[PDB]
């Protein structure tokens, strides 16, 4: 296979501001209405998040723009999308994006996502092709439009679909879906969430708690990746590709100390970064979200040598 359509497009990455976002539960331990503080990889608040578009119609007629780049993993990765009609399935996470290293291949092929940690050959323009079988009248998914070879495979797993629809809602949800990917200590752990959003595109002020889905033995360093897509074929009209529109959100993680406020039921609402501003670092000293009127001594500063 390896059918490819680069369709490179210009313009600057449209950025955004994650207000309160990307706060997962960094333990299984159940806590109730306490302020807990750890320094771990997170997406720090008020951060620059790139609102990317995998397929982007800018109207004259048609003009679907396939931009989705191979992206470095860096420290850690955050992800968010709406996609009332799913066009997104999984990610290619790896290093060489080729053989010679393992490959993290997440395919949420309906309905049984078959997570794959293997050695593949990923094409220059990988994505999942979808077509119509004509036998049993079912839309299959050609998975080798992503990658040519599948062999040597180290790991395999299956679970209930992370990507999930509800719909019937004519919008007003958009089914905002977030996935956090953190690769440490032999365990690459996946996080998820599903949220209604009524706003046109960008994110609200609410907190999103992400539980760990599976903690898996991965043992590979992933320095780079790209997302996956679901497209199809059309027939004679003045081949068909780029079903609907596609856009998503990406931001990189970073070690930061958060104070975590659990609820009576352990549902974290308020989280606060300590290093965010000189004001945020004092609230980490009192451990409280209420700061009484007065003067408090935040950590010292030093002048540094030129």
């Amino acid at each position, epitope marked *: 296979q390896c059918v490819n359509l680069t369709t490179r497009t210009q313009l600057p990455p449209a950025y955004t501001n994650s207000f309160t976002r990307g706060v997962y539960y960094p333990d299984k331990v159940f806590r109730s209405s306490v302020l807990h503080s750890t320094q771990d990889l997170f997406l720090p608040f008020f951060s620059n998040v790139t609102w990317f578009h995998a397929i982007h119609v800018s109207g004259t007629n048609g003009t679907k723009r396939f931009d989705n780049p191979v992206l470095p993993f860096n420290d850690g990765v955050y992800f968010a999308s709406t996609e009332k009609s799913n066009i997104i399935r999984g990610w290619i996470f790896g290093t060489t994006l080729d053989s010679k290293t393992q490959s993290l291949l997440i395919v949420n092929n309906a309905t049984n996502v078959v997570i794959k940690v293997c050695e593949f050959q990923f094409c220059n323009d990988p994505f999942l092709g979808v077509y*119509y079988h*004509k036998n049993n*009248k079912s839309w299959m998914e*050609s998975e080798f439009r992503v990658y040519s070879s599948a062999n040597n495979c180290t790991f395999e797993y299956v679970s209930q679909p992370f990507l999930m629809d509800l719909e019937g809602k004519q919008g007003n949800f958009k089914n905002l879906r977030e996935f956090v990917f953190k690769n440490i200590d032999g365990y690459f752990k996946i996080y998820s969430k599903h949220t209604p959003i009524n706003l046109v595109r960008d994110l609200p002020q609410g907190f999103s708690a992400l539980e760990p889905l599976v903690d898996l033995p991965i043992g590979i360093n992933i320095t780079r990746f790209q997302t996956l897509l679901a497209l199809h074929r059309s027939y004679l009209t003045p*081949s068909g590709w780029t079903a609907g529109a596609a856009a998503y959100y990406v931001g990189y993680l970073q070690p930061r100390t958060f104070l975590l406020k659990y609820n009576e039921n352990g549902t974290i609402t308020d989280a606060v970064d300590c290093a965010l501003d000189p004001l945020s670092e004092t609230k980490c000293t009192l451990k409280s979200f209420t700061v009484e009127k007065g003067i408090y001594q935040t950590s010292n500063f030093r002048v540094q040598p030129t």
Partner: antibody, heavy 120, light 109 residues
Framework: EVQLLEQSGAEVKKPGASVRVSCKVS????????MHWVRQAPGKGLEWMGG????????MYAQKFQGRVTMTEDTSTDTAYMELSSLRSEDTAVYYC??????????????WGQGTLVTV | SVLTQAPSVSAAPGQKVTISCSGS????????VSWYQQLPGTAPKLLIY???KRPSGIPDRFSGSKSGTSATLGITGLQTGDEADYYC???????????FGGGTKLTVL
């Protein structure tokens, strides 16, 4: 969009024989789109043949010619064999590989097939 | 075959004249019509599908209509290279199959 493979090649089979017709494709995969067949006799008109039915999901067979010609499909290699049997006088002719869409009625066929004559 | 159109028709170049095909309610009445072109010993080319839809690469100068059991293929702006046979077809539920007419070989005078 798509170009196809040939229908047969040149198949010349003297009387007392029968011939398969294997039409492959390119740019699509075989069972995302339905094939079709038409008799075309030189200096004459079209006579439809074979074919797949968007409704009911069956592969059609022209009633007039039904039972004399059969079709099979290999989805991965995109090989669709049209076997015509029991050679007769007027049945040597170009038989076109054609392809409408199973999704809708799509009486409109693929843009063109290149044609193959047979021999009786 | 089961449909009605003449063997041949002729007209002067650059003129405007069409070709029609007479079916029945059992064939053209409830079904969509297609039209095809072939040059001598060549690949018959889809002309118009549904009588209102041009395939990719078709001059806009062609149109179509369906009046009852009668379907006309709009042919305008005659060219020196437009001489060929045009074939009408539509879905048949009678024998539950695909049908065509005998074909009409145009001549540009």
């Amino acid at each position: 969009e798509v170009q196809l493979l040939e229908q047969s090649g040149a198949e010349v089979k003297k009387p007392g024989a029968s011939v398969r017709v294997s039409c492959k494709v390119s740019g699509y995969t075989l069972p995302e789109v339905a094939m079709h067949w038409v008799r075309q006799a030189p200096g004459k008109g079209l006579e439809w043949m074979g074919g797949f039915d968007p409704e009911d999901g069956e592969t059609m067979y022209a009633q007039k010619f039904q039972g004399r010609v059969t079709m099979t499909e290999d989805t991965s290699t995109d090989t669709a064999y049209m076997e015509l049997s029991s050679l007769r006088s007027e049945d040597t002719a170009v038989y076109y590989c054609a392809t409408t869409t199973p999704f809708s009625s799509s009486y409109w066929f693929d843009p063109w097939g290149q044609g193959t004559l047979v021999t009786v | 075959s089961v449909l009605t159109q003449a063997p041949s028709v002729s007209a002067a170049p650059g003129q405007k004249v069409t070709i029609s095909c007479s079916g029945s309610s059992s064939n053209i009445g409830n079904n969509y019509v297609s039209w095809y072109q072939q040059l001598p010993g060549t690949a018959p080319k889809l002309l118009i599908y549904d009588n209102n839809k041009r395939p990719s690469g078709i001059p806009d100068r062609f149109s179509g209509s369906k009046s009852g059991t009668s379907a006309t293929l709009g042919i305008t702006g005659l060219q020196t290279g437009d001489e060929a046979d045009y074939y009408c077809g539509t879905w048949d539920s009678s024998l539950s199959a695909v049908v065509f007419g005998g074909g009409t070989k145009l001549t540009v005078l």
